[PDB]
Amino acid sequence: DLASLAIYSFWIFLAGLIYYLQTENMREGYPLENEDGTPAANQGPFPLPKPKTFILPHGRGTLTVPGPESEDRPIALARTAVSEGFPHAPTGDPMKDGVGPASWVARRDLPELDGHGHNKIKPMKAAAGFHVSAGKNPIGLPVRGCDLEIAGKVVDIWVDIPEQMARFLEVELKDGSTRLLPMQMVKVQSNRVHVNALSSDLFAGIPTIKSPTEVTLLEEDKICGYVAGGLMYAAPKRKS
Amino acid sequence: ALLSFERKYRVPGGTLVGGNLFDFWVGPFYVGFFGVATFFFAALGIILIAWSAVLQGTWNPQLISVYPPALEYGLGGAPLAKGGLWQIITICATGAFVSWALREVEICRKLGIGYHIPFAFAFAILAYLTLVLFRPVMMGAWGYAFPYGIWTHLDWVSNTGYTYGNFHYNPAHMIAISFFFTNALALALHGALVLSAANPEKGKEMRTPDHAATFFRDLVGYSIGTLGIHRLGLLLSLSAVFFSALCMIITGTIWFDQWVDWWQWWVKLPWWANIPGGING
Amino acid sequence: YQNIFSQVQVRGPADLGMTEDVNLANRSGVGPFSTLLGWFGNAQLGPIYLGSLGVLSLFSGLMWFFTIGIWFWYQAGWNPAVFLRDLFFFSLEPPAPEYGLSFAAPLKEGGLWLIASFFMFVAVWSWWGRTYLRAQALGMGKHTAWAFLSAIWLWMVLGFIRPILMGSWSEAVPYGIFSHLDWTNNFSLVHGNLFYNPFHGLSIAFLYGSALAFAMHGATILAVSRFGGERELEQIADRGTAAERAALFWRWTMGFNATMEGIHRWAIWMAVLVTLTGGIGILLSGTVVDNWYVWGQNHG
Ligand code: BCL
Ligand code: BCL
Ligand SMILES: CC[C@H]1c2cc3[nH]c4c(c3C)C(=O)[C@H](C(=O)OC)c4c3nc(cc4[nH]c(cc(n2)[C@@H]1C)c(C(C)=O)c4C)[C@@H](C)[C@@H]3CCC(=O)OC/C=C(\C)CCC[C@H](C)CCC[C@H](C)CCCC(C)C
Ligand SMILES: CC[C@H]1c2cc3[nH]c4c(c3C)C(=O)[C@H](C(=O)OC)c4c3nc(cc4[nH]c(cc(n2)[C@@H]1C)c(C(C)=O)c4C)[C@@H](C)[C@@H]3CCC(=O)OC/C=C(\C)CCC[C@H](C)CCC[C@H](C)CCCC(C)C
Ligand SMILES: COC(C)(C)C(=O)C/C=C(\C)CC/C=C(\C)CC/C=C(\C)CCCC/C(C)=C/CCC(C)CC/C=C(\C)CCC=C(C)C
Ligand SMILES: CCCCCCCCCCCC[N+](C)(C)[O-]
Ligand SMILES: CCCCCCCCCCCC[N+](C)(C)[O-]
Ligand SMILES: CCCCCCCCCCCC[N+](C)(C)[O-]
Ligand SMILES: CCCCCCCCCCCC
Ligand SMILES: [Fe+3]
Numbered sequence: 001d002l003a004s005l006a007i008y009s010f011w012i013f014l015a016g017l018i019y020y021l022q023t024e025n026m027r028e029g030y031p032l033e034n035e036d037g038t039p040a041a042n043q044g045p046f047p048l049p050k051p052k053t054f055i056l057p058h059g060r061g062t063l064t065v066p067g068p069e070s071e072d073r074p075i076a077l078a079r080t081a082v083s084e085g086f087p088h089a090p091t092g093d094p095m096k097d098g099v100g101p102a103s104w105v106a107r108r109d110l111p112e113l114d115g116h117g118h119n120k121i122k123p124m125k126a127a128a129g130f131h132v133s134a135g136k137n138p139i140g141l142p143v144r145g146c147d148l149e150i151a152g153k154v155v156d157i158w159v160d161i162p163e164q165m166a167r168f169l170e171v172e173l174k175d176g177s178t179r180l181l182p183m184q185m186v187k188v189q190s191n192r193v194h195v196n197a198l199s200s201d202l203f204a205g206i207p208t209i210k211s212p213t214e215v216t217l218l219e220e221d222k223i224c225g226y227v228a229g230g231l232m233y234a235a236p237k238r239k240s
Numbered sequence: 241a242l243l244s245f246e247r248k249y250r251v252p253g254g255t256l257v258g259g260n261l262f263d264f265w266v267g268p269f270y271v272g273f274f275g276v277a278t279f280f281f282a283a284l285g286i287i288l289i290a291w292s293a294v295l296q297g298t299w300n301p302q303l304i305s306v307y308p309p310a311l312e313y314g315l316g317g318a319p320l321a322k323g324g325l326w327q328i329i330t331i332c333a334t335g336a337f338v339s340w341a342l343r344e345v346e347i348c349r350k351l352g353i354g355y356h357i358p359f360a361f362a363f364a365i366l367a368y369l370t371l372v373l374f375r376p377v378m379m380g381a382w383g384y385a386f387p388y389g390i391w392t393h394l395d396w397v398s399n400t401g402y403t404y405g406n407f408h409y410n411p412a413h414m415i416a417i418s419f420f421f422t423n424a425l426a427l428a429l430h431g432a433l434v435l436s437a438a439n440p441e442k443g444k445e446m447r448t449p450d451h452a453a454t455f456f457r458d459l460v461g462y463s464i465g466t467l468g469i470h471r472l473g474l475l476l477s478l479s480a481v482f483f484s485a486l487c488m489i490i491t492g493t494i495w496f497d498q499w500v501d502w503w504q505w506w507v508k509l510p511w512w513a514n515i516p517g518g519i520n521g
Numbered sequence: 522y523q524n525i526f527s528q529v530q531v532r533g534p535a536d537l538g539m540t541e542d543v544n545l546a547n548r549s550g551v552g553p554f555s556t557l558l559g560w561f562g563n564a565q566l567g568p569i570y571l572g573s574l575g576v577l578s579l580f581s582g583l584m585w586f587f588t589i590g591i592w593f594w595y596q597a598g599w600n601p602a603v604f605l606r607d608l609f610f611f612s613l614e615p616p617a618p619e620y621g622l623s624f625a626a627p628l629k630e631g632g633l634w635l636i637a638s639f640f641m642f643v644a645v646w647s648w649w650g651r652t653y654l655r656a657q658a659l660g661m662g663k664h665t666a667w668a669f670l671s672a673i674w675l676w677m678v679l680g681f682i683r684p685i686l687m688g689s690w691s692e693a694v695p696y697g698i699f700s701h702l703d704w705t706n707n708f709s710l711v712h713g714n715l716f717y718n719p720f721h722g723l724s725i726a727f728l729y730g731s732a733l734a735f736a737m738h739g740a741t742i743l744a745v746s747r748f749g750g751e752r753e754l755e756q757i758a759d760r761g762t763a764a765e766r767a768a769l770f771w772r773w774t775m776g777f778n779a780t781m782e783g784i785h786r787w788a789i790w791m792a793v794l795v796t797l798t799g800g801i802g803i804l805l806s807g808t809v810v811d812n813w814y815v816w817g818q819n820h821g
Contacts, residue, residue, distance in 0.1 A: 001821040002809045006801060007719050017790060025783035028760055029243035029768065040241035054438065056758055057445040063758055069244035077247065085265040087252040100251035101352030105762045112755050115450030115539045130533035133564070134556045138529060159531050162450045163465050164563060166529050167749075184747040188528045217755070221762050224748040228352035232253050243772065245765050270773035347773050351766045354523070354744035360736045394716045408702040424731040424792045428672070431789030432664035438757050438782055439662045449754055451659050453563075454538035458655045461552065461569030466751040468562030471525060474739030477732040507606055517598035518607035 023049040027065040035084060058117050060110070072106040075099060095205060095229050098222065102229025107217035114162045119214050121167055123156045126213050130159055138188045143171045143181070146230075147237040149200035152179075154193055158215070168215075168223075169193060171203070179206035180215065185227050197230035199237040241267065254350030256342065270350075274343035278336050285332030289388070292325045305389030309382045323382065330372055330385075337365045360474065363481045370485040378493050404491060409499035412487030419480035426476055430469050524746050526560045535565060543658040547572040570655060574647050582644035588637035589613050589696045612697030613637060615690045622690060637696060638680060649673060668793050675796040678804045686808050713812030720802030721813075727795040734791045738784055741767050756781040 023046055030048055032040040053064045076097035077088040094100045112120040124130050132139075143152045151171070155178060158168035168180040171193075187194040198206075207222035209215050215223075242250070255263055257273040264271055292306045293299065309316075309323025318324045344358035372385045386396040401407035408414070433455065437447035453463035464472060495502060507513065507520045515521055522528070535551040552566030571579070593611040597604035615638075616623075616631025626632050653666040684692045694704050709715040716722070742750050750756065750763030760781065768778040779787060810816045 001816075001819075003719075003805050003816060004820050006805065010720075010723070010798070010801075021783065021786055021790065022777075024786055025779045027783065028764075028780045029245055029778075031244075032241035033244055033246075035242060035247060037247075042241065054758060055445045057448060071245065071248070075248050077251065080252070085267075087263055088247060088250050089252060094251065099248050100253070101249070101350065103248045103762055103765070105245070105760060105765060107759050107761050112752070113448075115448040115454075124531065127533060130531055132529060133532035133554075134530040134559060135528055157529070157531065159533075161533065162453065162536060163467070164531055164533060164536070164565070165465070165467065165527065166531055182747050182749075183528070184522070184524050186528075187522050217759060217761065220749060225762050228747055231352055232349065243768065243778075245760075246769060246772075249766070249769055265773070268772045268776045344774060347770055348744070351770055353766050353770060354747065356523070356740035356744040357737065357770065360740040363736075364733075398714070398716060406702065406706045408706060420728055420732060423735055424728060424795050425672075427731045427735045427788050428668045428792035429665070430735075431785040431792065432668040434753055434785040435782075435789060436656055436662040436664040437754055438785075439664070440660050441657075441662065444660045446754065446758060447659070447661055448539075449752070450536075451539050451541070451661060452754070453536070454543075455655055455659055455661060455665070457538055457568060458543065458548070458570035458659075459652065461549075461567045462563075463565075464562035466753065467524070467746065470739040470742040470746075470751055471561060472739070473735035474743060475525075477736035477739065480732055481736075503609070509606075512602040512606040515600065515602050515606070517600055518596065518603040519610035520607055521603065 019046070022046050027052070029069065030066060031069075035079070035088075057115075058113050060108075073098075095202065095226060095233050098225055098229075100229065101232045102225050104218075104221040104225035107221050109216045109218040111214045111216050118161070120162065121158055121160055121215055123170060123213055124159050125156055127159055127161060130161070130164075132157070136188050136190060138169055138186075138193050141188070141191070141193045143169075143186075143193045143195060143203075145198050145200035145203065145237075146196050146234060146239065147199040147201075148239065151195070151198070151200040151203040173203055175204075177208070178212070179203060179208065180223050181206070182224050182227055195227075196238075197227050197234065199230075199234045201237070202230055202234055249351060251350070254346050254348075256346055256349075270343070270347050272343050272346045274339045274346060277339035278343060281332045281335035281339055285329050285336060288325055288329050288332065292329070295321045295325075302390045305387050305392040307387040307389075307392070308376075308385045311381050311383040313383065314381050315377060318382070326385075326388065327382065329388065334365075334369065334373075337361075337368065341365065356474070360478060363478050363485075367481050367485045370489050375488055375492065378489070384492065404496070405498035405500050407499060409502065410487050410491060411502065412483050412490060413499075416480055416483035416487055419476050419483060423473065423476035423480055426469070426473055430473065524743050530556065530559045530564065532559075532564060537568065539659065541659045543570070543655075544572065547575075572654075574651050574654065578644050578647040578651060581640040581647070585637050585640035585644055588633060588640060592633055592637075592696075609698040610700075612695045612700035614695045614697075614700070615684075615693045618689045618691040620690065621688055622685060631690070634693075634696070635690070638693070642681070645673060645676065664789065668789055671793040671796045675800040675803065678800040683804055683806075683808065686804075692807075708806070712806045712810070713814040713816075715802070715806075715813060717813035717817040718802045718806065718810075720798045720805070723798040724795055724802060727791060727798060731791050731795060734788055738788060741770065744770070753781055753785075 026046060026048055031043055034040050048066050051064050051066055053062050055062055076091045077099055078091050080086050080089050090097060090099050095102045098104045114120045138154045139156060141154045142150045143154060145151045152173045153171065154169045155172045156170040157166050158170060158180060159165065160167050166183050168183055169186055170178050171181055172178045181195060185195065185197050206226055207219065209219050252260060252263055255272055262271050262273045262276055289304065289306060293304045298304060306326050306329055307323065308326045309318035313323060318327065341358045341361050344361065345355060348355050376382050376384045386393045433452050437452045440447050449466055456463045532554060537551065548570050549568045551568050554564040555566060556564060558564055592613045594604060596611045597607060613634050615634045616626035620626040620631060624635060649666060649669055652669050653663055656663055656665055680693045684690050694701050745763040745767045748761060748763035750767060756764045764781045768780065771778040
């Protein structure tokens with residue numbers, strides 16, 4: 001009976017498909033490791049796939065995965081227990097050390113480029129023809145932290161040019177330097193921008209950018225990591 | 241064992257209940273208080289199902305069926321063999337789903353991410369509880385709920401639907417379907433788009449998101465954008481479930497006749513009800 | 522703040538797109554900008570590409586639509602009040618079983634169905650061609666076209682392949698809102714309840730699974746959008762904390778996880794298999810299996 005054959009064949013196909021897909025999703029993070037960074041004994045029943053190589057645009061090289069995995073950064077954490085599977089306590093300040101929910105990855109220290117090789121993200125003042133088109137314009141608003149203290153003022157919006165979206169607010173602090181705040185971690189209100197994740201004293205600690213008109217993937221990761229980390233780690237001063 | 245990048249995120253904190261007490265992992269799995277709750281509710285539920293199997297008399301996965309109390313029982317309790325087990329298993333199932341959600345919330349707090357996933361999952365839970373709790377209660381009996389069996393629950397889908405004629409005519413159900421179909425369309429498109437850019441023709445460099453936007457603009461004259469498409473998929477999938485739950489909550493309560501006949505309100509509007517011709521005059 | 526709607530919109534010069542090997546002569550100017558759309562996605566409408574295949578597709582598509590509507594107007598006695606009142610009840614029906622696979626049926630009793638179906642056939646396949654060709658002109662993979670083909674498969678099976686193998690056009694789906702739902706119901710009754718078709722049950726698992734998948738995936742990307750997680754192609758090329766936190770959410774929750782590229786492979790297949798399994802289920806119904814309940818009692 002043909003329908004019997006089709007359904008039997010389909011389950012065989014489906015099992016192969018699942019095998020293939022699970023192996024495709026092992027191109028990052030594998031082999032598994034013990035808590036000391038060493039290869040773990042039990043990798044499970046799925047082997048690593050043949051490497052593939054992505055050819056990056058604008059002469060930025062290639063990526064080949066799977067390949068040798070490295071954090072490429074120190075990780076300021078230590079064991080809290082004598083056996084596997086417990087948490088790892090921060091050894092200094094986790095916001096500054098970039099661990100836990102303040103983690104960042106060692107992404108390339110270049111800016112993301114659009115399809116034409118120009119920087120993807122730019123402060124709006126450097127992006128010709130870009131302006132606020134709808135909604136409350138936050139430029140000029142005081143920025144308030146979770147301690148209800150004013151941390152600074154918004155001096156620009158950093159925009160994704162090809163997507164035409166707001167990605168950060170550039171906030172100037174009391175000392176005259178600025179920080180980027182991810183747009184997803186601010187609340188624009190009629191008379192202020194409110195920032196839940198950070199108390200006013202934690203703004204200076206936001207990682208800074210090298211060139212004041214661009215931001216690199218490494219810098220984005222450090223900034224976003226750090227403000228996200230405030231949700232757990234600004235326990236000395238948070239209220240509604 | 242840990243993924244190569246994992247250790248840095250396995251710090252203390254994030255728990256909603258128990259402080260540091262259940263703040264650990266088993267292999268890949270985070271535990272937490274709500275992991276202990278999930279194990280308890282799920283293990284008891286499974287044990288009671290395996291027991292209900294014996295009181296039926298059978299070990300085949302595609303025969304085991306746990307039926308709710310008969311309609312006679314109303315909303316009261318029922319002896320274990322005649323619906324009571326279904327009632328307990330249902331409480332266990334709800335406990336396990338809510339516990340799983342709340343364990344998801346703890347994992348979000350530890351990872352510093354948004355709560356969108358458990359929020360989304362709560363829609364699936366609300367649909368489940370529509371079928372086993374809210375709808376039955378509004379209708380006066382546990383017996384309007386579906387039985388827990390692989391084939392027996394489809395029997396219930398089929399009898400429940402044909403009670404109101406062809407269930408296609410339920411307008412909340414039309415909207416729900418439309419969302420499910422649209423979601424699959426969107427998931428196909430999105431997957432394909434990302435992969436077509438990351439995996440271009442043989443020579444070539446990885447395409448950029450601008451190429452992806454350009455593809456869709458060339459094809460349909462519009463690109464929703466990388467944030468937009470994830471917003472859309474979330475909205476389409478949650479809307480399908482919301483309207484699923486809506487279409488059943490209204491059925492047997494507010495509307496209990498043949499769903500086809502509902503449409504008569506339109507054809508009977510006074511400005512065209514009595515005009516000769518067409519299908520209805 | 523949840524990132525479902527944007528708080529502030531920005532606009533700049535219209536993005537006219539990447540060029541690559543596209544013929545720019547065939548690309549329109551940019552449409553207008555919608556602030557409404559812009560709360561949710563991008564504000565820019567157009568440009569669109571309309572070469573010869575696109576004009577052909579748009580034209581047969583409209584001809585399909587107008588053929589059905591001219592028939593609906595007829596059925597309404599040319600009266601607009603009746604047309605609106607009865608809109609969901611009208612139906613352009615295929616030829617009766619008597620006419621087999623022939624084109625000899627009168628316009629008023631099947632021939633118009635064939636004309637509208639011809640136009641639809643040309644519209645969909647030329648649009649498929651366009652799906653492939655636009656990717657090609659940009660140097661992109663053909664995943665869109667392969668995916669679209671899965672949908673076309675179910676469509677083909679319903680209106681073309683299955684009628685051909687059953688010996689008559691009478692067996693195809695009518696063009697009407699209510700009538701096609703009646704056809705669907707009736708198809709199941711006549712084949713012994715489609716819930717016993719194992720391919721229908723797979724189709725459902727995939728349909729539900731796609732809602733599962735996109736709810737999971739959309740929610741995951743929005744949850745890590747505070748680290749730029751929606752920039753997926755760059756997270757593929759150079760993994761960030763967004764991708765790591767995403768993976769790890771799921772690893773800790775259910776014991777395994779995806780990559781930023783691989784989740785799109787899970788995705789495309791979850792969706793494509795809806796209509797793959799679906800078309801098989803339908804194709805086998807009446808050709809090889811007359812009653813799925815019966816077939817289920819035997820597996821044979
Ligand atoms: C003959 C039958 C009638 C009919 C009668 C009904 C009836 C009756 C119902 C539907 C319902 C639905 N029908 Mg209908 N329907 C018909 C024809 C159709 C057709 C079609 C092409 O013809 C389609 C596409 C649909 C589509 C749909 C959906 C809109 C909706 C189902 C999804 C849902 O509710 O998910 C919601 C999701 C869930 C309930 C799942 C929840 C999962 C929980 C939270 C988690 C479980 C975890 C699990 C136990 C874990 C296992 C552990 C392992 C490790 C994994 N119907 C015919 C005409 N339809 C249903 C509905 O709307 O329900 C609300 C419903 O009750
Ligand atoms: C009483 C009715 C029967 C029944 C009868 C049928 C029949 C008959 C069929 C299904 C099919 C399906 N059913 Mg069933 N179904 C029932 C009960 C259910 C229930 C339920 C909870 O009870 C559910 C969840 C489902 C679910 C499903 C889906 C999994 C599947 C459709 C997939 C899809 O995406 O199709 C939708 C997608 C398409 C049709 C693809 C279309 C692609 C084309 C190319 C698009 C052209 C567009 C056109 C040109 C318009 C242009 C628009 C403009 C551009 C704007 N059924 C009951 C038992 N069901 C289908 C299937 O595959 O079954 C195996 C099918 O044929
Ligand atoms: C709301 C949009 C869609 C959605 C979303 C969604 N589902 C989700 C999530 C989200 C966002 C998760 O985060 C969560 C997850 O972890 O996924 C991997 C989940 C999940 N969705 C799941 C399944 C699922 N979702 C479905 C549907 C959908 N989920 C929607 C279409 C369906 C359908 C359509 O039928 C199913 C079967 C699980 C894989 C997972 C939740 C796992 C969970 O809660 O685990 C804890 C509980 C257990 C391990 C076992 C409990 C055992 C019980 C005590 C006994 C069994 C009782 C049961 C009622 C018997 C039923 C028998 C059947 C034959 C009827
Ligand atoms: C894998 C399974 C899922 C899937 C996938 C899928 N569908 C797809 C694709 C893919 C991968 C495409 O690439 C293709 C696409 O282009 O998507 C945007 C498509 C597509 N899926 C479509 C529809 C569709 N898909 C469906 C389903 C599904 N598609 C599944 C759930 C359904 C259902 C659920 O029934 C429908 C109705 C189309 C939107 C699009 C294919 C378009 C096509 O073939 O068009 C031919 C031309 C016409 C129809 C034009 C006629 C016009 C209208 C009838 C009315 C008026 C509008 C007009 C365009 C205005 C013009 C103005 C003039 C003045 C110039
Ligand atoms: C306002 O009025 C005007 C006149 C302006 C209008 O234009 C109004 C128009 C309408 C009111 C239009 C209404 C349209 C509908 C309600 C359409 C309904 C459509 C469906 C629900 C369709 C469902 C399914 C269709 C399927 C499965 C079709 C499949 C078709 C094919 C696979 C094509 C097969 C080809 C054939 C049979 C011919 C092949 C012949 C050769 C020689 C190759
Ligand atoms: C519907 C079922 C699809 C899910 C397939 C599940 C397979 C996941 C197992 C992965 C093992 C993880 N390890 C051990 C590689 O980390
Ligand atoms: C992308 C892979 C996802 C795999 C999900 C498969 C779930 C199987 C559901 C059982 C269907 C049973 N049927 C209908 C064959 O009896
Ligand atoms: C009752 C049938 C359900 C089939 C789905 C089971 C898939 C669970 C995969 C979990 C893998 C986790 N592990 C063991 C790798 O950690
Ligand atoms: C939970 C289902 C897992 C099914 C995966 C089985 C993979 C079979 C190996 C086939 C070798 C090509
Ligand atoms: Fe995505």
